Amino acid sequence: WLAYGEIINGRFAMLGAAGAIAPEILGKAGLIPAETTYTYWADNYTLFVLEMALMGFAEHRRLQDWYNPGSMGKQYFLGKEVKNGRLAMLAILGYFIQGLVTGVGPYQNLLDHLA
Amino acid sequence: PEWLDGSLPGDFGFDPLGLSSDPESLRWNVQAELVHSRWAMLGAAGIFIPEFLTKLGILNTPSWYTAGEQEYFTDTTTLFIVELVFIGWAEGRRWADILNPGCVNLWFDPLGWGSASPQKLKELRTKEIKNGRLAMLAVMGAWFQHIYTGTGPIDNLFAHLADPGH
Amino acid sequence: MRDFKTYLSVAPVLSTLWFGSLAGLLIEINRFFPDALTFPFF
Amino acid sequence: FEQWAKPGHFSRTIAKGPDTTTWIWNLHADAHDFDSHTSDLEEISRKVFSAHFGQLSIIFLWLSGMYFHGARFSNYEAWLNDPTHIGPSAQVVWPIVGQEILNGDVGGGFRGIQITSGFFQIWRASGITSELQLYCTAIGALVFAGLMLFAGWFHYHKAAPKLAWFQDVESMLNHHLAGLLGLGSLSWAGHQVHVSLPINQFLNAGVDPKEIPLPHEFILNRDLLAQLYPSFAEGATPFFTLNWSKYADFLTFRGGLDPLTGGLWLTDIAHHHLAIAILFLIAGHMYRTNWGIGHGIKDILEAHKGPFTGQGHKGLYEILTTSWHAQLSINLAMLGSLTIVVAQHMYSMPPYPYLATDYATQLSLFTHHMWIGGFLIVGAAAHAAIFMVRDYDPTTRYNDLLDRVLRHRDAIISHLNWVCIFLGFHSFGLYIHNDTMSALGRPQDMFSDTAIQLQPVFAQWIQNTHALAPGTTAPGATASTSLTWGGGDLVAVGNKVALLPIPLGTADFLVHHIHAFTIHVTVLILLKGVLFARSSRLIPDKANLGFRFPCDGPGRGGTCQVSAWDHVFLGLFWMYNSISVVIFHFSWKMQSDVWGTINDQGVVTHITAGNFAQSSITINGWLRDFLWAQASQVIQSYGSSLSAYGLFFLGAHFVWAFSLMFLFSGRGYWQELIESIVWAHNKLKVAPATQPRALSIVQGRAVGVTHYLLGGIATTWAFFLARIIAVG
Amino acid sequence: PENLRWFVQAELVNGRWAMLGVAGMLLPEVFTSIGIINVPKWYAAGKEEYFASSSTLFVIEFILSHYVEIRRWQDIKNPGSVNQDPIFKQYSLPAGEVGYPGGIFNPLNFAPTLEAKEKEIANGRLAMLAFLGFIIQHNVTGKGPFDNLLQHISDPWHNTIVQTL
């Protein structure tokens, strides 16, 4: 719905993707390079973000299949309050921007750090 | 002026009549559906799978020419006329058995029970051996061609990317 | 299903619907025997 | 939930254990409407933007066609490259029974019916280019309907939604300005500068086909546009603090129009759309909301008074807040001319490139884009009625400015009623004379130019001044604000003409004073029937019959057509007589005395003669030379592609015709009838039980209105059309 | 089902004229051999004779026909009829018309008259399916073959509509 209910999760949610775009390095895209070693890519050889289907399906419905009821658990298995959190909604928005809107991994100095 | 009020289910508002939906299917003989949906492609459960095999025909493929009769545009488009009139009278009056006769408006018994009902493991025998087969003609659903004008599923094939590259 | 029956109807677009999804056929036939001009019996 | 019908809906007695046919147009003729619903806003506000919905989801459902049926079968490419000669096309049609020839085969390698109303000119305006492209915008907008039609279900349904914060009216009236214009105007500039400006400036010669700088470019890195109109494009924009002067280059008030193909400058459209852009962004905060900045909602209006005109214009309504009907005239008269304004504007001084020269849309468009306008206003204040006979509650008013009128009726209306003789009666009663004075009346002496002249003259006016206006006086801009006005400073292009000094005179303070008339005795019809409407000085008590309500007494010796609903039932006819006039005057100016061609020795050569001037004075001159001098187009015009306009106004004349049968006719006469036949079914047992009664009075002042009023339109669009194109 | 013992004879009459109808062109039927769309007439003949056209075999042999058929008609109407084969009953034992002259206005019932075997009746209609084979070809394909081990179910050729005729 909800409302109000859909912030905490949004909180945790973007947090990891935001977490992607900071603790990274990175390494592709590419673009600009070359876009698409380990084995090569080992990465299957080409086009495989459809495990996401299953996977990004497998967490959100698997979250909510919850709901405490949770069923989804199941039988067995052995085959100002928008003011606060919602300003917090902004300052997390934001530092996607500067953590993206220039390169971070600068690594421009200053000195050197490894090297 | 019934009822209506009631009318209905008899009121309203606001809920569970429930019978319920609407918004999908379906009350009366939503079993004509049932009884049509099994057969129709249990039928098909034997057209493409023979096909999905033949590519692999170990040593010799098949062969059969005729040995029947050979002349001026001879044989098989004539045709369904005979072939699927025969299996025409087949379809029809087996499955006027949603009930069925006129409930809508010699002897008696056989068999013993209620469509020799069931049994109560054989109800399960029919189960998703009936349904899972129409889970698997969902493979059909998704073309049922695999020849997607696809070249392609040749040189036979079919599949088989896994997925090589280079 | 039944029985004649009756059976069940629906609302305002049935006399209408009849125009389209079936009645068209006409233009197939009228294509099939391009125009008519007059009587082709068989 | 819920729902569904079945008998009975909203006209209280709908089910009635039926008895008769003629309910199937009491329902089809109530259905949307209210009070025969309820003003109980917590279920009527939550219908109006429900809406209001689809109309868009329909408008989307629309536009998502007019590119698929552009970009699935171009004339766009197979022409674009070459404006000028070889022109429009958006439909080609299946090969049934002789459809074919209906899709011409005259468009640059294209079979197909030719197309009137820009679009080619609307999308060669931005740029886009490539069918696989605004076909990549056919899909952009079709689901994109979906979600907007997924708002029906959004609120209302699982969400009986809110009048509490519908009623108020300040956030929205501020935000439309800012909010959802302001996402626009200027956020079309970012588009109109970067996307639009140069994929046009560099179209303006070279750049023929396929290598077409997919808009893809020109973001992050500049250099190219930079290589074009400069601005110094480092990472520091001057006019952050007043280097404004520089990032200009390409937007000083250029006015005139692109003589390398008419339109008029896109170098002349960011300055127009970031100024009128932001007024609407700023000026869309002036009212209350929450944060203590703003104005009266209404608290402004009762601000001021005046002795007579007393209280002033005071305490301005509280349903004006509430709901629609009360309001509902104003968003229409307004929107009204806001489609006669843009009209008398568009042709009047061309937007998107390829108009001025064009025709079959420096006319076409021009119209419709004046029907919708006429239509809209000339049926806007049938909302002043209802309202009084409706949405108006108990009290709010007396001493209101409102009432100051309702008192001063009889002697406000009245003093129009006379103008509406003089102005007309005798100022139309004025071609007449010069017919009685050309037939009978010997050029010797009468009302035309070398006649009831009027020597220099008529001026000029002004306009002209509109032509000293840019050389000083409003210092610059460029070239005379719109060639249409001015002196002899004269252009065009594309062999044929574009716009020029279109000089007026006799033939000009004539005609005119008819639109000048008409839109008098076309209002007051209107006002007579807008004021009296609920209280009429002659059945005094109306709100006792409804909105429509037929007439009443065979008594008082002839009381009929009293309702505004029926004050509206002819409120229209005239509009048609007035919109479906005025168009006319236009299409014999543009042409005959504006369109051109070219040859050379100083000599522009028009579609028709500088006739007009003295062979459209006399009433007649418009059938001598406006019919059988034209129509030839459509008269012959079979076995071809004019082969629809030889096929429309046919069954458009009938269906101007098959009006009067229902509109001149009786009503009891007809019911009286549908027995007789009845005997056939019945005795021979067939017969209904929805007792087949014969169409309800109003209902047939609800057809010879539509039908008349479908009739003499298409007709003239079956007609005016095919004139233009080959002698077009 | 359908209706009441209205016509029986009418269609019976029809089926009577039927078999020997389809016996008629059943000479073209080819014992072995002699067919086509016809012109002639049993065997012989050779009196003086049965002729054309200031004569026609028609009006002579088929004016007098009329009283030979009206007798039956008025025979039906006012029964009237043998003892009683055709309207209706004595032997043995057909498909029963069954009813007597009136209803509840019409329905004190109406049709419990089925039951049995293969039986008498049948062939009466057989010749109208014969017909709707036998008419259809004869101007569409105007000869009647049957031919195994040769080229039955193979064919040979083709032949449609618009050729010309």
Ligand SMILES: CC1=C(/C=C/C(C)=C/C=C/C(C)=C\C=C\C=C(C)\C=C\C=C(C)\C=C\C2=C(C)CCCC2(C)C)C(C)(C)CCC1
């Ligand atoms: C009997 C029969 C029939 C017949 C028919 C007919 C013969 C018809 C005709 C009729 C006529 C005789 C006429 C009519 C016509 C039509 C029309 C006429 C339409 C319309 C329209 C529209 C829809 C439009 C719109 C528009 C707009 C948008 C605006 C501008 C203008 C126009 C118009 C374009 C039928 C088929 C049914 C069926 C069967 C039988």
Ligand SMILES: CC1=C(C/C=C(\C)CCC[C@H](C)CCC[C@@H](C)CCCC(C)C)C(=O)c2ccccc2C1=O
């Ligand atoms: C003819 C006429 C009627 C009678 C008109 C009626 C009842 C309209 C007929 C409605 C439709 C057309 C029903 C006819 C049958 C159709 C629904 C469809 C069958 C035909 C084919 C398309 C299959 C009036 O009521 C009337 C009232 C006031 C002034 C003038 C008149 C008037 O002139």
